[PDB]
Amino acid sequence: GETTDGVYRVMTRRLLGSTQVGVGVMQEGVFHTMWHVTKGAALRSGEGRLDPYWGDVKQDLVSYCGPWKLDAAWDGLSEVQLLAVPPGERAKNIQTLPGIFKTKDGDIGAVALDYPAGTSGSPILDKCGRVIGLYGNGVVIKNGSYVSAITQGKRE
């Protein structure tokens, strides 16, 4: 299968036609997505198979072929870009200043951008093009607007 670094759509033919259920990042031979996109199932890349290697429902993350490789972090001050990959539409960069999720266990950056559920797993990047987390696990606020955490894993 295709192992080139970059952003990929995650598709299924189980439903009507070919449906995009999410997005992920290929980096250093490892495929990175959110757990709620694949539910930990194996994936196909052409004639090849990608098996899950690590995952955690609470973090809502999963890696395939190897351990989680993404370790860049939002600096807490600068604008970032969501590299949105919406279903049936071209990859597009959206620049934004993250807000914050304040939790009992610390603060996390959050992006107030609303895309279809199938955009989950799209990468959020810093000005060096490094992936600081994945978009797609968040909350619906007072006025009905969607806000995603910037979800990042740990590089062991």
């Binding site: 970059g6 990929y8 759509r9 194996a42 590299l83 807000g99 939790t103 266990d105 990047l125 909350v139």
Partner: protein, 39 residues
């Protein structure tokens, strides 16, 4: 049976569309990975 298809390179775009606000929210994260608002 899920499959992946390349959609692009991961690169910062100069002069990308700039939007979205920056809300500061108190949230809770449960064991199932669901975020909720704390009021």
């Amino acid at each position: 049976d899920m499959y992946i298809e390349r959609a692009g390179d991961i690169t910062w775009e100069k002069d990308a569309e700039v939007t979205g606000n920056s809300p500061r929210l108190d949230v809770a994260l449960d064991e199932s990975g669901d975020f909720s608002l704390v009021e």
